[PDB]
Write a protein that binds this DNA or RNA. Structure first.
Ligand SMILES: Nc1ncnc2c1ncn2[C@@H]1O[C@H](COP(=O)(O)CP(=O)(O)OP(=O)(O)O)[C@@H](O)[C@H]1O
Ligand SMILES: Nc1nc2c(ncn2[C@@H]2O[C@H](COP(=O)(O)O)[C@@H](O)[C@H]2O)c(=O)[nH]1
Ligand SMILES: Nc1nc2c(ncn2[C@@H]2O[C@H](COP(=O)(O)O)[C@@H](O)[C@H]2O)c(=O)[nH]1
Ligand SMILES: [Mg+2]
Length: 443
RNA sequence: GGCGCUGCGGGGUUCGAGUCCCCGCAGGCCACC
């Protein structure tokens, strides 16, 4: 398994075959015909226009260039009108920038309105850079399509492809820029082994410097970090992957993993062995797009996690999951039970003013002096993490994300033990606890 | 929708809050292509 021959075996996994290429061409041809009939200005961009889309993931991006004077409302109205007119079937769903997702002759297509700017220094809609990304790249990426494909496939197989909040990984465009900068997939991997959280890759200037954060300077706009939404942890995972790959290259790095079914009894024994409190907050998923939902789930987890820390249940990690109907916030804590009694610090013996007040409070036990200060024994409201979270979620729902909190307000429950193992959260549980041998790349 | 630093303020906790928790006010970025 020489490094060179793994890469050629990997091409069979990332390069699309002829049936798929042909399906795209036919869809492309039919799209042009429909848009030409409407006499609107448009431009094919993205991975389809540069021939760098992954096998099995054919999608065509078509942009509509509208005059800059148009209001955001006019952009939306005209964009959606033309999108619906050009597509066989369609769905409209988005967080802020309007567009139309649909199908043409079996192929998936995004029709996206934007403003026809000259120069993208100061943009008016969030997508206005994309036509300029295409112009900058089209000449510099020829002959390197398969290198880009290898990089995307590599990232995708390891769950860090895509810059959307569900993933917080590497966008496709980002991949194309890395290939332009390093020349190939192998050189990107080799150099990535030495990236740090301070690395700044400036493709237009052809240099690597250091900065305050991991920054990939967009060649069409020096203020834009193309890796803005790449999390520190996924930056780390990738660097670690590149190091592992060179050490011992394998085709397995390009093979997707999937979770294995874990019998609830195996999970039970695993939790018993660990001796921790494992539990979940279950509630109804709000009907909102992934890009609104996941940051709220992230927020709600962190808020409850931080509550657990300061209440001394010593939480280990947290995770979350959205099924079709329910969201789950998962937790593991070292403490299943804490004493009802704790100690609160009082004033120095010196000032009888504050001492007299500190002692005036009626308690079940006598305060005491220790190391020159007064102290008292107080009693906790709850003594298990499940009790604490029940109280916390019932009264601090409003701080758990706009839509997530509102849902928690109407209903939630704390689930644990084997009832939790019957819920669709085993993969998140295995990942969170670091369970060995719970995934497989087997086909 | 999520995410700022500092400043002003309300409230809770506390013997004691500039410091911990909750909320408001005042000086763009990211995701959806
Ligand atoms: N988060 C982002 N950051 C920077 N550019 C983005 C972007 N999302 C979309 N774009 C731009 O819009 C183009 C198409 O976006 P997408 O269809 O979502 C991914 P793609 O570039 O087509 O590759 P892919 O289909 O293999 O995933 C990109 O090439 C890029 O120019
Ligand atoms: N009343 C009271 N004052 C304290 C206590 N601990 C520290 N301080 C005071 O708070 C100040 C902190 O600023 C210190 O100068 C100290 O005098 C305490 O437990 N009780
Ligand atoms: N007023 C108040 N201050 C606290 C409490 N717990 C911690 N602190 C803060 O902890 C700080 C410790 O600093 P110190 O005063 O001991 O030098 C104090 O300034 C104090 O304000 C509390 O319950 N009440
Ligand atoms: Mg695409």
């Amino acid at each position: 398994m020489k490094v060179e021959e793994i890469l050629e075996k990997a091409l069979e996994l990332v390069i699309p075959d002829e049936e798929e290429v042909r399906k795209g061409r036919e869809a492309e041809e039919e799209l042009r015909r429909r848009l030409d009939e409407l006499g609107v200005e448009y431009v094919f961009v993205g991975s389809y226009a540069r021939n760098t889309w992954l096998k099995g993931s054919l999608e065509i991006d078509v942009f509509l260039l509208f005059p800059e004077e148009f209001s955001k409302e006019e952009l939306r109205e005209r964009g959606l009108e033309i999108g619906k007119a050009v597509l066989d079937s369609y769905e409209i769903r988005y967080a802020e920038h309007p567009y139309v997702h649909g199908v043409v002759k079996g192929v998936e297509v995004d029709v996206v309105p934007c403003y026809k700017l000259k120069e993208p220094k100061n943009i008016k809609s969030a997508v206005d850079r994309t036509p300029f990304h295409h112009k900058w790249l089209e000449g510099r990426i020829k002959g390197k399509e398969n290198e880009v494909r290898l990089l995307k496939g590599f990232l995708k197989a390891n769950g860090i492809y895509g810059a959307e909040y569900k993933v917080r990984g590497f966008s496709g465009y980002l991949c194309e820029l890395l290939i332009v900068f390093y020349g190939s997939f192998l050189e990107t991997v080799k150099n990535a082994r030495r990236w740090t959280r301070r690395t700044v890759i400036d493709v237009a200037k052809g240099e690597v410097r250091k900065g305050e954060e991991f920054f990939v300077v967009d060649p069409v706009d020096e203020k834009r970090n193309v890796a803005a939404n790449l999390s520190l942890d996924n930056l780390a995972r990738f660097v670690h992957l590149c190091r592992e790959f060179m050490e011992a290259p394998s085709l397995g790095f390009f093979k997707p993993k999937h979770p294995l079914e874990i019998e609830p009894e195996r999970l039970r024994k695993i939790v018993e062995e660990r001796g921790t409190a494992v539990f979940a907050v279950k509630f109804r998923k709000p009907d909102i797009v992934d890009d609104n939902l996941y940051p709220q789930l992230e927020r709600a987890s962190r808020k409850i996690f931080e509550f657990l820390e300061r209440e001394n249940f010593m939480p280990l990690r947290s995770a979350f999951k959205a099924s079709e109907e329910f969201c789950y916030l998962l937790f593991e804590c070292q403490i299943k039970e804490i004493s009802r009694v704790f100690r609160r610090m009082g004033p120095q013996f010196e000032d009888e003013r504050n001492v007299k007040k500190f002692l005036s409070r009626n308690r079940a036990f006598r305060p005491f002096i220790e190391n020159g200060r007064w102290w008292a024994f107080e009693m906790r409201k709850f003594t298990t993490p499940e009790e604490g979270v029940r109280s916390y979620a019932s009264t601090h729902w409003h701080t758990l994300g706009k839509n997530v909190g509102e849902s928690i307000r109407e209903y939630f429950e704390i689930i644990s033990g084997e009832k939790l193992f019957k819920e669709p959260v085993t993969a998140e549980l295995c990942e969170m606890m670091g369970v060995k041998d719970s995934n497989s790349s087997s086909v």
